[PDB]
Amino acid sequence: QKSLLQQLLTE
Amino acid sequence: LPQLTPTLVSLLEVIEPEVLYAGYDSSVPDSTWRIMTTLNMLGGRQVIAAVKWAKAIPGFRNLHLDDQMTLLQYSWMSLMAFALGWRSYRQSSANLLCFAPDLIINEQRMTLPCMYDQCKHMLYVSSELHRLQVSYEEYLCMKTLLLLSSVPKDGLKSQELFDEIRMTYIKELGKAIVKREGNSSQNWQRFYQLTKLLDSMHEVVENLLNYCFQTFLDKTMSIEFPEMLAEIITNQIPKYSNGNIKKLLFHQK
Ligand SMILES: CC1=C[C@@H]2[C@H]([C@@H](O)C[C@@]3(C)[C@H]2C[C@@H](C)[C@]3(O)C(=O)CO)[C@@]2(C)Cc3cnn(-c4ccccc4)c3C=C12
């Protein structure tokens, strides 16, 4: 998926 | 000589996210509703800036990515209120809320129809920082502790490592006290007072969160929240209720 937060925690 | 030998505190000082500007259309309004929408928008950016900051904290990312999420979703309002409080404190001799260098809520706007009840809590942390004359270093540590101030009732998936980090920063805050001037009896009282302040943040967070949740779910009001922030809120409202949230307190007082 994406989950804005989760995605930033891996950006 | 030193400076070239990094200290936990000197590192906290450099990862501190830089000041954001509001964008604007600076003729800044009187409608309580526009203020909120505007602040919610800036808030979204402010939170992303904070997440990045969390990832730069020594030991933070060495936690299960799941705990890194739980933490940020439990403490964002806290990190937000504390940083806004500090910026408001260092900004002026008193009375205001400094959200950005190009976005300030003064005495006038602060008292528009539905503003004061929301802002008074934000002014609180600002007055507290002033009252106790908190140093920049004390604040850098306290703010880190705030990120680690709420764990799930049923622990984390890195409990051990968490406990070790939380303590590292508690001791780190102790040092910042020893440094600010140099007493011995006051060091105790001083540590008692700051841990007290940290403990009271859960309370202001609780007040600010009610308005945040009430406002987000209304749809009779229709107040805009940015995409990511909206997600975190929809995600936390169910848990914040059930008592699945545990607040670490320095004083059972
Ligand atoms: C604390 C703090 C509380 C939030 C505020 C806005 O979202 C509007 C909220 C949710 C308010 C609590 C709630 C009552 C609220 O008034 C509403 O319910 C409106 O619907 C926000 C995120 C926005 C913002 C833009 N800047 N920045 C900021 C700047 C420098 C350091 C820290 C933060 C801040 C700090 C914020």
Q: Which residue of B has its CA nearest to A4?
A: B228
Measured CA to CA, the distance from residue B241 to residue B29 in angstroms comes to 34
Q: At what angle do helices B65-91 and B185-217 cross, to 10 degrees?
A: 110
Give the closest residue to B79 by CA, choosing from B54, B45, B42: B54
Whether the CB-CB separation of B126 and B85 falls below 8 Å is answered with yes
| Chain A closest-CA separation from residue B110 CA (Å) | 31
- Expressed in angstroms and rounded, the spacing between residue B1 Cα and the centre of ligand 1 is 41
Q: At what angle do helices B185-217 and B159-179 cross, to 10 degrees?
A: 130
Query: Residue B231 and residue A10: Cβ atoms within 8 Å?
Result: no
**Identity of the residue in B52, B55, B69 whose CB atom sits nearest the CB atom of A6:** B69
Residues of A in contact with B69 (CB under 8 A): 5-6, 9
Chosen from B69, B75, B233, B236 to mutate, greatest number of chain A CBs within 10 A: B69
Distances (CA, A) of B71 to B55, B105, B146, B225, B245: 12, 29, 10, 21, 11
Measured CA to CA, the distance from residue B98 to residue B92 in angstroms comes to 9
Measured CA to CA, the distance from residue B97 to residue B89 in angstroms comes to 8
Q: Which of B19, B46, B76 to probe ligand 1 with, by most ligand atoms within 8 A of CB? A: B46
| Chain A closest-CA separation from residue B228 CA (Å) | 6
Residue B8 tokens, joined: 């936990």
- Expressed in angstroms and rounded, the spacing between residue B101 Cα and the centre of ligand 1 is 15
Residue B209 tokens, joined: 């969160």
Whether the CB-CB separation of B133 and B90 falls below 8 Å is answered with no
Please give the domain boundaries of chain B with CATH numbers for all domains: 1-253 (1.10.565.10)
Q: At what angle do helices B8-15 and B159-179 cross, to 10 degrees?
A: 100
Pocket lining for ligand 1, CB < 6 angstroms: B 36, 39-40, 42-43, 46, 80-81, 83-84, 87, 99, 118, 122, 208, 211-212, 215, 223
User: For this experimental structure, what is the resolution in angstroms?
Assistant: 2.5
Measured CA to CA, the distance from residue B241 to residue B167 in angstroms comes to 28
**Is B132 buried (19+), middle (13-18) or exposed (0-12) by CB count in 10 A?**
middle
**Is B170 buried (19+), middle (13-18) or exposed (0-12) by CB count in 10 A?**
middle
**B152 pairs with which residues across the strands?**
B245
B19 contact partners, CB below 8 Å, separation of at least 6: B87, B100, B101
DSSP class of residue B71 equals H
**B246 pairs with which residues across the strands?**
B151
**B100 pairs with which residues across the strands?**
B103
Measured CA to CA, the distance from residue B242 to residue B78 in angstroms comes to 20
Per DSSP, helices labelled H in B133-252 are: 136-147, 159-179, 185-217, 227-242
The method recorded for this entry reads X-ray
Residue A5 tokens, joined: 């937060």
DSSP SS3 for B68: helix
Residues of B in contact with A5 (CB under 8 A): 51, 69, 72-73, 228, 231-232
Q: Which residue of A has its CA nearest to B227?
A: A4
| Chain B closest-CA separation from residue A9 CA (Å) | 7
Query: Residue B232 and residue A10: Cβ atoms within 8 Å?
Result: no
Place of tokens 């800044």: B28
DSSP SS3 for B34: helix
